[PDB]
């Protein structure tokens, strides 16, 4: 019996009254449009935006902490080298804005040096992420923005083939250029090569080298695209699993352990992978939201009272939209809880509080590599956790409105079925 229900659950009686009233249904649909703008059209006040940003900064931060400690070297085919130094610019090396790959004789691989092939793949993702963070990420609904990215590396030493025609695609080592394209979007890449002799003036390093410049135009800076870059960054590290050893700075924070393999940070890498996975799922709700616009008013037909049993074909879409928004909100929350130091324990808590949520740069803007970036995240991790919480706090009303819109629609789908 139903009077008996609506006695103990009077909240349910109100819900049914609201579901029979086009004017309350339309109000709930307006609210869904406004909370959608907040989630996918805004930046500072979008929980969704803040969690995407957090997932990306945690990946970048992880490399800013450990990159300088990581062995790399060898030649182009993942082969060991006899005497190859390959240096990657705008990377957070030890007291330096470059990372030097100069480990010879050892075969590249697991618990050894990172091959130059993996490092190139890693470095490209890093430079793209850093350029995008620096310019500022766009709102989740902006899917056709692009950024330009430029980066350089150098090869020296007898036998070093990491800047060759085969590694690069460029015909003449001195002055040559090659253009290739790639992928929904066309990304154009221009690669250029130059040779600097050992004696040339303005060559302080005492040796001959080849320089490769890569210029990428039309790089997508959408959230989905950047998360894919962050995933590439962290997965390359985890799969290559190179040896590292840290300079334990004889003063404050202490790295645990000091020698080892990079994938030995299992809790940290898992957490970051899980953040990225959750932010990807979160950003996928965007198209669910766009596909089920809630802006048309609903309300009977033929000047005849609204009938919740027959006239509610729109309910399916309203439910899917409301559910997609709630899911965004919850995933955004899950992202923050994966990395928030308040709920973390031991080794993993030290890593985040002592290194990842720290910056040693003399705030400097996002995406800036200095000679003191190494061993600190320098990716605004603490500020982002804080802004995620601030934005969740300012989403109180909207979350209730979304749950109400979902309940209304769910009632109409039940009645229609």
């Amino acid at each position: 019996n139903l009077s008996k229900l609506l006695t103990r659950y009077s909240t349910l009686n109100t819900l049914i009254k609201l579901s029979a009233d086009p004017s309350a249904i339309n109000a709930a649909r307006e609210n869904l449009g406004a909370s959608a703008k907040n989630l996918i059209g805004d930046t500072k006040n979008s929980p969704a935006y803040q969690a995407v940003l957090l997932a990306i900064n945690a990946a970048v931060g992880f490399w800013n902490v450990l990159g300088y400690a990581t062995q790399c070297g060898g030649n182009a085919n993942g082969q060991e080298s006899t005497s190859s130094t390959t240096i990657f610019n705008n990377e957070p090396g030890y007291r330096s804005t470059s990372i030097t790959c100069s480990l010879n004789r050892y075969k590249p691989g697991y618990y050894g040096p990172m091959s130059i092939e993996n490092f190139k793949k890693l470095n490209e993702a890093y430079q793209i992420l850093q350029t995008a963070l620096n310019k500022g990420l766009p709102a989740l609904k902006e899917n056709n923005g692009t950024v330009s990215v430029t980066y350089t590396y150098t090869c020296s030493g007898e036998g070093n083939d990491n800047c060759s025609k085969k590694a690069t695609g460029v015909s003449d080592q001195n002055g040559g250029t090659k253009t290739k394209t790639q992928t929904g979007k066309t990304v154009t890449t221009k690669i250029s090569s130059k040779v600097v002799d050992s004696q040339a003036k303005g060559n302080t390093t005492r040796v001959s080298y080849t320089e490769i410049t890569n210029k990428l135009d039309g790089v997508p800076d959408s959230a989905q695209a950047l998360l894919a870059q962050a995933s590439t960054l962290i997965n390359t590290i985890n799969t290559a699993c190179p040896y590292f050893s840290v300079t334990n700075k004889s003063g404050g924070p202490q790295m645990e352990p000091t020698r080892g393999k990079l994938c030995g940070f299992t809790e940290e890498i898992s957490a970051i992978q899980k953040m990225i996975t959750d932010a990807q799922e979160l950003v996928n709700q965007t198209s669910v939201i766009n596909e089920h616009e809630q802006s048309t008013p609903v309300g009977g037909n033929n000047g005849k009272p609204f009938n919740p049993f027959t006239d509610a074909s729109f309910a399916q879409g309203m439910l899917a939209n409301a559910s997609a928004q709630a899911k965004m909100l919850n995933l955004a929350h899950q992202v923050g809880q994966t990395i928030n130091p308040d709920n973390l324990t031991g080794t993993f808590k030290n890593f985040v509080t002592g290194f990842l949520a720290t910056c040693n740069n003399k705030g400097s803007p996002p995406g800036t590599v200095t000679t003191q970036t190494f061993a600190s995240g320098c990716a605004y991790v603490e500020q982002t956790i804080t802004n995620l919480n601030n934005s969740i706090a300012h989403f109180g009303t909207q979350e209730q409105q979304i749950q109400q819109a979902e309940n209304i629609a769910d009632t109409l789908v039940n009645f229609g079925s």
Partner: nanobody, 113 residues
Framework: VQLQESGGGLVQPGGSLRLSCAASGSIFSGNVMGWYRQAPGKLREWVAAITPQGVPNYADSVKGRFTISRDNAKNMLYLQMSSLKPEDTALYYC????????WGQGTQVTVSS
């Protein structure tokens, strides 16, 4: 698992009440927390919230009269209510934001002359 509000009662307009919520560590620790209320004939309405670092914010209907606070050592959430009006009559509830799917029992506040 656990949200448990207390402190409600019948009061006079102009009056004060202090509500409490004892929350489990799971729910409370490192989470935004807040207060909600459900008045006769209406659905649940958000009322106030506070970040882990203690920044409060309020719905317009209670701003300047209610104060939300948190005690991080004891997993406690509080809502000090002043200048109460009949319109504040409701079942008051606390939860994290975003909400844990199971609500506590609430605490009744009635404001009446």
């Amino acid at each position: 698992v656990q949200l448990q509000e207390s402190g409600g009662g019948l009061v006079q307009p102009g009056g004060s009440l202090r509500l409490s919520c004892a929350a489990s560590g799971s729910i409370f620790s490192g989470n935004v927390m807040g207060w909600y209320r459900q008045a006769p004939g209406k659905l649940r309405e958000w009322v106030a919230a506070i970040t882990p670092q203690g920044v409060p914010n309020y719905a317009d209907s209670v701003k300047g009269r209610f104060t939300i606070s948190r005690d991080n050592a004891k997993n406690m959430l509080y809502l000090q209510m002043s200048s109460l009006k009949p319109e504040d009559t409701a079942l008051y509830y606390c939860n994290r934001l975003p909400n844990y799917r199971s609500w506590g029992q609430g605490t009744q506040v009635t404001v009446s002359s």
